[PDB]
Amino acid sequence: ESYVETELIFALAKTNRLAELEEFINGPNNAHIQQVGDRCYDEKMYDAAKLLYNNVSNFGRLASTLVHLGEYQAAVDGARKANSTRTWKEVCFACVDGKEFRLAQMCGLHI
Amino acid sequence: KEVERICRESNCYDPERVKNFLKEAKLTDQLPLIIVCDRFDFVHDLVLYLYRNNLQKYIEIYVQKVNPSRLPVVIGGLLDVDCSEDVIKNLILVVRGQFSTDELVAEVEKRNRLKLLLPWLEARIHEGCT
């Protein structure tokens, strides 16, 4: 049953049982990421939806969830392919209105 | 000859549990899915998954001969599933059925990369129109 898979992996996130969950993904999950792949970062139980959006290749969403996750190096590493201006312009105007010049001018490669 | 026969014909299933079945019906020559899945439009996810396992021409030939009409939308799916370009280019270059450059430009502008379509560019700008 797909639903029991979805809720199971969501609970594995709930009980933060990471490695086992991820190696399970090597099994034919047929589950619903972007539903539970959403539910994780929705619960903000971060560092978990990361692996999900990776192994199911959830570009833009994986990058945004990386940013929200506290991940920023790998976030830009994926966004350079994604090129979604979202976090770019976020940091950009945050520093511009703040009259700053480091983070905005660093991430400004996507303008 | 029998099975996807009714998949074209009959439409009284749950085509979603059905399509679910398809997904789970590992039978290695599926093209009723190319019919009913898009009959109820699970097609981004569909083709997504497809190439994910793999996809070569099957939706392509479906939208080729079965139905050129869904070209633009599947085109959008293609670039949302983030894939290559020369195939649909040739598709436009090869005889196309029903299609407007005015939706192609909008979709690819959403995609931001209109770069090549010189055949259909000729089609558009030679109407009094890039």
TrEMBL record, chain A:
CHCR repeats lie at residues 1-104. It is found in: Cytoplasmic vesicle membrane; Membrane, Coated pit. It comes from the Eukaryota. This is Clathrin heavy chain. The chain holds residues 1166 to 1276 of 1675 of the full protein. Clathrin is the major protein of the polyhedral coat of coated pits and vesicles. It comes from Sus scrofa (Pig). Belongs to the clathrin heavy chain family.
